[PDB]
Amino acid sequence: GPLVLIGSGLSSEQQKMLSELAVILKAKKYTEFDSTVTHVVVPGDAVQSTLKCMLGILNGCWILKFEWVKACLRRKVCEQEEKYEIPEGPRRSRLNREQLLPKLFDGCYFYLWGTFKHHPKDNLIKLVTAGGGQILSRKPKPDSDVTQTINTVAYHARPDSDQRFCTQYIIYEDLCNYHPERVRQGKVWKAPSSWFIDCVMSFELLPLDS
Ligand SMILES: [Cl-]
Numbered sequence: 001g002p003l004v005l006i007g008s009g010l011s012s013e014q015q016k017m018l019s020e021l022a023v024i025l026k027a028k029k030y031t032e033f034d035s036t037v038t039h040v041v042v043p044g045d046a047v048q049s050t051l052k053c054m055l056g057i058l059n060g061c062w063i064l065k066f067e068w069v070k071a072c073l074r075r076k077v078c079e080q081e082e083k084y085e086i087p088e089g090p091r092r093s094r095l096n097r098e099q100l101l102p103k104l105f106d107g108c109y110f111y112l113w114g115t116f117k118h119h120p121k122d123n124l125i126k127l128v129t130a131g132g133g134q135i136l137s138r139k140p141k142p143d144s145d146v147t148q149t150i151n152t153v154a155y156h157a158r159p160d161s162d163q164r165f166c167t168q169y170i171i172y173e174d175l176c177n178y179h180p181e182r183v184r185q186g187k188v189w190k191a192p193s194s195w196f197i198d199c200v201m202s203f204e205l206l207p208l209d210s
Pocket of ligand 1 (some may be wrong): 149151
């Protein structure tokens with residue numbers, strides 16, 4: 001298809017330059033993230049811990065250093081994206097979706113507990129859904145647990161982690177003076193919002209017990 005570009009953390013001069021490139025490439029340039037976005041450009045050589053970037057990772061977009069815009073504009077060409085792609089999380093996710101593999105939170109369920117202020121609740125719901133996870137409207141417990149109705153696993157869990165098959169998460173906003181006594185009860189973990197965000201930024205289902 002058509003390319004759809006967006007910038008995260010770009011200066012005004014950078015955003016103009018991105019629009020200039022979209023014209024050269026016959027592409028769209030947006031300011032709000034959408035599932036049609038193909039390319040997220042960052043200002044330097046590092047991922048931004050922003051919603052736009054995180055949505056771009058969960059979508060397996062190209063997350064590219066601003067040098068890509070400079071290079072394309074000097075050549076009037078869509079330069080080869082892999083040579084400008086941010087490594088680690090972005091790249092692993094891009095490859096994951098090219099191979100039509102499960103999204104990061106496939107087989108995972110999330111219940112958003114308590115008050116959210118510094119990780120907006122809307123943001124977390126966006127990210128859950130974008131990563132292929134399921135938002136729960138009632139606190140998870142065994143007598144209502146859908147994972148008994150069909151074998152449910154989390155593809156991105158490490159091989160030998162309980163998170164392969166214990167895939168349900170109570171998420172709380174960290175540092176409310178709350179560390180739990182047990183991080184896991186049955187199939188349900190209690191995890192801070194800061195863990196969830198770290199999983200996204202890394203494209204990993206990071207361990208809670210190990
Ligand atoms: Cl079964």
